Every structure is written in C-alpha cells, then in structure tokens.
C-alpha cells in the first residue's frame, strides 16, 4: 500500500489507563478526537479516519497517525492518568508532535486550543476563517459547560433510545444553567426529532417539537450552522418530505463533513428508494468514523436499515 | 483494506488500442483525465488518485474507478478507436456510468464538457461557482487550440529540457496565432522560468523573463488563478527569496490541489533545508499522481533531488 501523505488516522489507546478514567475524562478525550477530525476533514484537502471507536487494527494507506494515549505518572505504575498526544509520521515513524496534558479544574479549553494551534502548525495547515467562526459558535467557553456537552455527545454517539433520553436530559440541564450556550438548544432540539421519530403517533409532541424547531431554525447566531440542516432534514424525513429532507442534508455535508451527516444522506436515499447511492453515503459514515457507534447509526438510525441487503460490502468486510 | 467511496482511481487502459493512436488523441484522453483529477481534488471532498500514467496495478482503498479505455468498432478487430470511459462503484462492481466518445473535428470541447456534467450527476456533486469559472479561464474554447494546448500540458509532463523547449515553442504558436488565450502566455511564461532556471548565469535572459513575467502576474483575466503563484514561486526560487517562494506557492495550492505544486512545494522546503516537509510534499505529489513523469520531476525539477537521501520512503515503496 503507498502511503497518502494527507490521510490522518486518529487513534485512542489504553482505554482503561490506570487512574482515573473511567467515563471521567474519556468522553473529553473522545469530544475532542471527533472535534479534530471534522475540523480537519471539513476544514482542509486532508482526509481524516477517526478510529477512536473501532476495534480492528487493519492496513491503511494513513501516512500520519495522531494517537491519544493515557497515561499515569508510571513512577507509581498506576496513579492520574495524564492524555498524550501525539502526531507520527508513518513515512519515517518520526513524531511531528508530542504533547502530554493533566487535566484541571478549568484547563479542558486551554488543553483543545492548544491541540488545534500546535496541529495547524505541525500540518502547516493555517484555519481558515470558517472554521474559526465555527469553532466559536459550536463549543461553550467554560470548560465545566465542554465537559458536560461532550458527555452529551458521547451518549448521542451510542444513539440508542435510552441514550438519546439521557443526552437529551443532560442539554437541557445545560440550557436550564446557561440560555446562552444556543449550540446546545440546538442539539437538543436535533436529539428531541430523533427521539420524536420513534413515537410516530404523537402528534402533541410533534406539536410541541414543531415549536422547539421554529425558534431555533430561524436563529441568526446559527446562521451558516450545519446543525441547523441537520435538524431540517431529520424533521423533514419524519414527516416524509424527501425533497425538502435531500437538500437540506446535502447543504449540512456542505457546512460539516461528518459521519452522522452521511448516515443522515444515507437515510434520506434509503427513503427515495436509491439503495446504491444509500450504500454509498453509509460506507462513507463508516470510512469517516468506523465503529459500533456509527454502525449503530446505520443499522438503527431513525428507522431500521438492513446492513445484509442495502449495504452488504459492510457486511462482509466485517 | 476498507473501501473508501471518497476515494477514485484514474486509470488509461489499452493505451496501444488498435487504430489509430497514438499520440493523435492519446495526449487528449490524458488532459482530460488529469483535468478531471485536479478539479475534483480543488473543488470537491473526494481524493483523486490520477493513475494515467503509472505501470503498478497495486492494492487500493479506492471505492470508485474512473477508466478510460480506447476501444476499435472492433467489428473488425482494429479501427478508428472509441473512446471507453466507466466509473465504476468497486464496493459492488457496478457501474455508474458508461459512455463512448469518437473524436471529430470539433467535438473535443463537447466531449469533455459532456463527461464534467455526467460526473457531477453521477457522484452527486455540482460543481462550484469557483470551479466553474476556472475551467473557464484555464481553457481555450476552440477544439484545435484544446487539441494542441494538451499536446504541450504532455511536454510538460516529460520535464525534461527538450519537452520544455518543446512545450514552450508549442505554446508560443498557440499565442501567436490566437493572443487572447491568455492561460497559454501565462503556461509559457511558468515553462520558460522553469528552463532558465538551467542557465542561472544567463542574466540577460533573466531580465527578458521578468519582464514577459511582470507583463502576466498583473493581468486581470488570470486573477485568482493558480498559474500565477506557480509563476511566482518559480521565479522566487530561482532568485533565492525562499519565503515570497513559499508564501505564493502555498495560496497556488489553495487554488489548485495538483501534483505539481506540491513538487514546487517540496522544492521549496528543501531550499530552506527541511527535508522531511520536503518529502512529505513529494509524496502527495506522487498520490496525487503516481509514475515516472512526478517522479521525473521530484528528482530533476528545477534543481536535482536525490530520492535516496530526501524521499527514502519512495525509494523503498519503488
């Protein structure tokens, strides 16, 4: 295989360090893994594969790898577990990045920032403005609110019922404390269609939801959103509109490049009756971020897909 | 390896069809393969991988095929040869397209235009209102000056002093006998640096080429293209201003996602000594496009490269 130079995998290793972690600082870790990766693959000409939640270690054409690794002092053999990070190029196997952080009480910004300054700078990858101004407007800026909405985003990841009901739970304990963190009302009202989408009958909640979306969609802070399509075309799909439900999702992939996107793209082609392209836009999800989580998403997302016949080069890969 | 539909294959097949190519329409098939490539690359999500001109038939993660075959009537073995082009979906095998082109007298513009509109329903993906306007200023709009415009884009790609020589007369008829293909005096311009960075001591062909070259960059028609900061950072380098050489090849890049600006970008890595940014550059470049002509030009382009000491990876990948 001839190494791609622009292919970035993302790896997390030693998932149960020594002391402390634990759901504690592993859904950090996990946010700000998927925030690089679709920064990156939106972002720039380099394609990310973020394996963070795959379990098979296969052959890749990845010239980098970034591996985050916890961990421990080690003078102890187990004691708190620091979060390394670093970059290695797999044309020499020489590290362009070593970065080793400790967490804090209000360091978990700090810590992200830097990850994103010292990338831009070993890639010679300068942000663009785009993804500044997003940045800005998708993460809170206290990190007590960033670790609980990326706890949040780790139950949205496992997308189950159950799951979704406590990500749920959890943004609006978020939005309760801060009104002013609209990002989150925003997923909440994207994780509420979805939910809403498995009680079809419910017309009272889709009353109730129909109200929730309208003065979110509109909101001029989440202009230029991905978010903001999202929530347009599960919205739209639940209520059979596939026109409506296509052109939103396309103009999301457009703002976000990310594998809930394609799975979403996915859907909305499994609906209009196109398996092929359906099979397409699910593999593309599974290269973006393979995994349970994402197979989840295809299998169960929204409504059932049978990998077996829409899918089956998935099937047999795995 | 996981299949990734992101992620096309440019192949040529056949390339001794029958009757009766060729150089005849086999520098056109090219062009038009590299320029599918790079807009793609520039203009879209998916990775291209332009394998016209590499032997290797080695092991891919590439999810689509796109195949350009040269195919005779065959009703009698070896005639007039077709043109064959397939994208093929590798995860089933099937095929997304389909289409048989004849060359005429002046159809090659239609061909092409026709082929960039097929591929933009085919992968689902318009092209840009960026991309759009490029293509417009990029190519000449009569079929014979495309006919011979990509006959000097397959000098260029040889790279050798005698190919340049060639391009560069080729695109000074072209010039001559039709002024306002602007591109054309623009390509000479950067073919022309790119020689005389062989003859340093020629100062006065240095002052004829900073002035034909002052008489471009300038030019509105050529804003925002990329020919122009190739220009520049060849120019650049040839005078030893590494960093007004870096600056304008890294917006060319923005501009223009091609193997050659990533060989200029690696040739400007090495001037300032960093040899492993140097081979990084080189290896896009070669993924970009594999094969002798990249090859040729990482280790003879402006100034020789020992791939052995620079690029060792290449060495031992070839």
């Known amino acids: 295989i001839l190494l791609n130079p622009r292919d970035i995998d993302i790896n997390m290793v030693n998932k149960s360090c020594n002391s402390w972690s634990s759901p504690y600082q592993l859904s950090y870790a996990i946010g700000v893994g998927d925030l690089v990766a679709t920064s990156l ?7 990310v594969h973020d394996k963070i939640n795959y379990n098979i270690d296969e052959p890749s054409s990845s010239g980098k790898t970034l591996s985050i690794a916890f961990v421990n002092q080690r003078q102890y053999r187990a004691q708190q577990c620091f979060m390394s990070i670093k970059l290695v190029d797999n044309a020499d196997g020489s590290t362009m990045l070593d970065k080793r952080y400790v967490i804090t009480n209000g360091n978990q ?4 920032n830097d990850l994103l300054e010292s990338l831009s700078k070993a890639l010679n990858q300068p942000w663009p403005q785009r993804m500044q101004e997003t940045l800005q407007k998708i993460l809170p800026h ?26 749920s739970e959890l ?16 997923e909440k009202a994207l994780v509420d ?16 939801l129909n109200t929730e979306i309208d ?8 202009n230029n959103l991905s978010i903001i399509y999202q929530i347009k075309a599960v919205s739209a799909l639940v209520k059979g509109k596939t026109d409506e439900s296509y052109q939103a999702i396309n103009t999301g992939i457009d703002l976000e490049m990310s594998w809930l996107n394609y799975v979403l793209l996915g859907k909305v082609y499994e609906m209009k009756g196109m398996n092929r392209e359906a099979a397409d836009a699910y593999l593309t999800a599974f290269n973006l971020r393979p995994g349970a989580n994402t197979l989840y998403w295809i299998e169960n997302g929204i409504f059932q897909t049978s990998v077996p016949y829409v899918v089956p080069y998935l099937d047999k890969f795995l």
């Open 109 to 112: 910004l700090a810590i992200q």
């Open 41 to 47: 693959n939106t972002f720039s000409t380099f394609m």
């Open 171 to 186: 943004l609006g304990e978020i939005v309760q404390s801060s009104p002013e963190f609209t990002y989150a009302r925003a």
């Open 193 to 208: 269609i979805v939910r809403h989408s498995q009680h079809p009958l419910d017309e009272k909640q889709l009353a109730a």
């Open 215 to 222: 003065n979110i969609v509109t909101l001029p802070e989440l």
């Open 142 to 167: 206290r990190g007590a609110l960033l670790t609980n909405f990326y706890q949040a985003h780790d139950y949205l990841l496992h997308g189950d019922d159950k799951s979704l009901n406590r990500a």
